Amino acid sequence: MGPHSLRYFVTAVSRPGLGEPRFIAVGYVDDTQFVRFDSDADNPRFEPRAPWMEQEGPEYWEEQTQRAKSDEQWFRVSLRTAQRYYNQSKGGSHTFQRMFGCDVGSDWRLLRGYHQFAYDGRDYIALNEDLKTWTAADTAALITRRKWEQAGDAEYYRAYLEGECVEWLRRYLELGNETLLRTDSPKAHVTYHPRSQVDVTLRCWALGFYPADITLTWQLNGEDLTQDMELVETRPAGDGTFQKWAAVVVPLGKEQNYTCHVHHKGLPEPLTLRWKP
Amino acid sequence: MIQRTPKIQVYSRHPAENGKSNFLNCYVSGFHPSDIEVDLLKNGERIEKVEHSDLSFSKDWSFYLLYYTEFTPTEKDEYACRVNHVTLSQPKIVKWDRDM
Amino acid sequence: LYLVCGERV
């Protein structure tokens, strides 16, 4: 079944005077976290955060640990440089973030490689989707852009994104196939909430599903349009699955005319649900 | 710089049944910068041994965390998530509603 | 597979 992604989300936060920056890296395959590194652990190592990763041997962990430690110093240095670029005080804490990885189609073609940075919550510099040129968000990032074009770093990153990023994603999907290539279908039900003599709320719940992509609709008899349905953002259950709900306000006594429709990869067809007195 | 304020959902892992064990979740997202203080509360009191996920972030660079604890809901006990962040001048408190 | 950054900022 379909596309996949390998992503790393790396955060470095300076702590001037309180010593070295906080450096945290987390890796995800699709909607599932699988590794971390945190500089503040008493013995900072790259570590598994999904049980299927315990299949990788000690050489993998040692190598990855070393890579994290090299970037820890990269960010130490780059944080000090950005402080100077922006003429900021030496004492304040600032944040650099970096996101990199690959999105692949089901035949493993690269749909998009990423290698991208933010500073203090705004875009700083990003490898463009051509994997050859750079987009600077401001004039401080223009100085970085020039240094990276001079260094030819784009080609180093492209070679990773087109090659190794994809090869390792494949490996992880194989190591974690029982969970990463599974679906868990939503368990769904409708709840009924009295309010006034004219109105009630019906809430359509979907629980325990993987992956996170889901769509809930409400229909009145035929369908639904120009609609004021309340929705929450899809949220983690904490056990590797997700939750979502969608609610409508309807006239008292007309509840049986409304149907909830749940759409998810794990179902053999959309699920239709009603309020069941 | 762009600072963003935390958006909060408080909810249980499973549908609540009074006297039956469950997990209480506080999902905090959409914030920047990443320093944040989150407590889960039972009738106003800080619950001990609350765990949280590893820090990560979304496409717009905003951070997110899941805070959680095992709990046993009852009819009368009130549960909440209390969040302090540099964007706020006093904590945000969101009560757990079992129907949301 | 974590990929180290090259040139600094």
Numbering used by the authors:
A (entry chain A): 0 to 276
B (entry chain B): 0 to 99
C (entry chain C): 1 to 9
Authors' description from the paper:
Here, we used cellular and biophysical methods to investigate the molecular interaction between the G9C8 TCR and the native insulin B chain 10-mer peptide, 15LYLVCGERGF24 (G9GF) and 9-mer peptide, 15LYLVCGERG23 (G9G) as well as a heteroclitic form of the peptide, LYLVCGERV (G9V), presented by H-2Kd. We solved the atomic structures of each of the peptides in complex with H-2Kd, demonstrating the peptide residues that interact with the MHC binding groove and identifying the solvent-exposed residues that are most likely to contact the TCR. H-2Kd is unusual compared with the binding motif for most other mouse alleles (that have an anchor at position 5 and the C terminus) in that it anchors at positions 2 and the C terminus, reminiscent of most human peptide-MHC binding motifs.
H-2Kd·G9G crystallized in space group P1, and H-2Kd·G9V crystallized in two distinct space groups, P1 and P1 21 1 (only the P1 data set is shown here in detail), which showed identical features (data not shown). The solvent-exposed nature of peptide residues 1, 4, 6, and 7 in the H-2Kd·G9G and G9V structures (and possibly the G9GF structure) makes them the most likely TCR contact residues, supported by our previous data showing that modifications at peptide residues 1, 4, 6 (residue 6 could affect the conformation of residue 7), and 8 reduced T-cell recognition and could act as antagonists. The first 5 residues of G9V made 102 vdWs and 12 HBs with the MHC binding groove, whereas the first 5 residues of G9G only made 102 vdWs and 9 HBs. These observations demonstrate the importance of optimal anchoring at both the N and C terminus of the peptide and help explain the substantially lower thermal stability of the G9G and G9GF peptides compared with G9V. The G9C8 TCR bound to the non-native H-2Kd·G9V with a comparatively strong affinity (KD = 13.6 μm). Surprisingly, despite a weak monomeric affinity for the G9C8 TCR, H-2Kd·G9G tetramers could still robustly identify cognate T-cells.
